[PDB]
Amino acid sequence: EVTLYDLPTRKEEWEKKYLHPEFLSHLQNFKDFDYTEICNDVYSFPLFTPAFCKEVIEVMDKANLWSKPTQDTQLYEVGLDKQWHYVVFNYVAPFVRHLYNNYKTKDINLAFVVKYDMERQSELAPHHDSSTYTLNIALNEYGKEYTAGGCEFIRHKFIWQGQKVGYATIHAGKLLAYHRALPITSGKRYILVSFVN
Amino acid sequence: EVTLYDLPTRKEEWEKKYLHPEFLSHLQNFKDFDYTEICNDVYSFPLFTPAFCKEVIEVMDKANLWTQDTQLYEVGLDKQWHYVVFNYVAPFVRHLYNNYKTKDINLAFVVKYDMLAPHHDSSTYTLNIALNEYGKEYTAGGCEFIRHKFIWQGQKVGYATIHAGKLLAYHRALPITSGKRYILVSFVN
Ligand SMILES: [Fe+2]
Ligand SMILES: [Fe+2]
């Protein structure tokens, strides 16, 4: 069976297993793609399947390379950098052109999985991202595996919580999307974050 | 007696002759600064005096080093512009855009339109200053913010427009129908 690492060697099997059917079916026509503008210039949309999120979490938990300050692990620390590069420049980049007036994706700054839990507490200060746009994918289920959490978009005066498994949030990195993460109060929360220039 | 090049050696006199009084008198308190949000997250505000704009054009017309443009370093004004951005513009950017810290300057140049594709800028934010008078020295012209669906025409002399460079402010210049149009543009990261 195809794994997370078999992209693009087994690309069509990879897409059917790991890409959300709605996003894959609209790769060449995002006009009718069911995405939501939760606040000005910030969009939520399905991207990956639950199997993608579960397997990403399994790889990260088994590797146990979390930083000892938020608890995260870079995708390249588990050998997924080339697969993530293919994902960004073939799947996400066409959607970014549709959302943001044909903006051309240049390069990837960072990509990592963040693990919020009750054991480690950290300051979640407001900040801008070191990116042109930021991709945030929810990897586990709100309410079932954690409570509270989310993200406050300070400039928009909008709090985004309860993101669905496999659904992504995209927003500007600098200047116009000042934001802070909000702490969980229960369980564990995994997200995939990527800073793209 | 003071010239464009006397910053920051003669800073106090440079500010009075070249910085717009409304901007100069609100450097430490931008809460009462009378700026206009022409469209979402795009702000127009007074920045420079008519003497600054006329002298900048005279430097560029004399140099004749000509998008037909001339970079500020080609006329020895890059250091003066760096002081302007980090000491005057950067505090205003923090007030407008949630304390965003200006990192560095990519480009600074004067554009001359005489007798225009949509694009993103190569910058975090872009500064656009009208250098000569709409209706007197040129007609029509201006800018369209495509994502905002907003036509912006008739910018006053010395007034600046600030907007995001990448992603969120797809724009294009509008053609003029007569005369010449000078603008000072800076791409800031
Ligand atoms: Fe962030
Ligand atoms: Fe431009």
Author numbering:
A (entry chain B): 683 to 750, 767 to 895
B (entry chain A): 683 to 748, 768 to 816, 822 to 895
From the paper:
Although its sequence resembles invertebrate LHs, L230 has >35% homology to vertebrate LHs with similar predicted secondary structure and solvent-exposed regions. Our findings reveal features of the L230 active site and dimerization interface that are conserved in human LHs, show that L230 dimer assemblies are stabilized by Fe2+-binding, and demonstrate that L230 has telopeptidyl LH activity and promotes cancer metastasis. Collagen-like proteins and collagen-modifying enzymes have been detected in numerous pathogens, including mimivirus, and here we showed that mimiviral L230 has telopeptidyl LH activity, increases the formation of HLCCs, and promotes metastasis in an orthotopic lung tumor model.
Fe2+ is coordinated by an active site amino acid triad (His825, Asp827 and His877). Tyr814 and Arg887 are positioned to bind the 2-OG C-5 carboxyl (inset). An enzymatic activity assay employing bovine skin collagen substrate to measure L230-induced conversion of 2-OG to succinate showed that activity was extinguished by mutation of Fe2+- and 2-OG-binding residues but not non-conserved Ala879. The L230 LH domain formed a tail-to-tail homodimer (889 Å2 interface) through loops in the DSBH core. L230 dimerization forms hydrophobic contacts between a leucine (L873) and an aromatic pocket formed by three tyrosines (Y798, Y801, and Y831) on the opposite subunit (inset, c). With a buried surface area of 268 Å2, the L873 residues lock into the aromatic pockets on adjacent subunits. L873D mutation caused loss of L230 dimerization and enzymatic activity on collagen but retained wild-type activity on a synthetic collagen peptide, suggesting that the mutant protein’s integrity was intact and that dimerization increases binding of lengthy collagen chains, which leads to increased apparent activity. A deep U-shaped surface cleft created by the dimerization was flanked by the active sites of each monomer, a unique architecture compared to other 2-OG-dependent oxygenase structures. Surprisingly, dimerization was lost following mutation of the Fe2+-binding ligands or Fe2+ removal, and dimerization was reconstituted by adding back Fe2+, whereas mutation of the predicted 2-OG-binding ligand did not lead to loss of dimerization, suggesting that Fe2+-binding stabilizes the dimer.
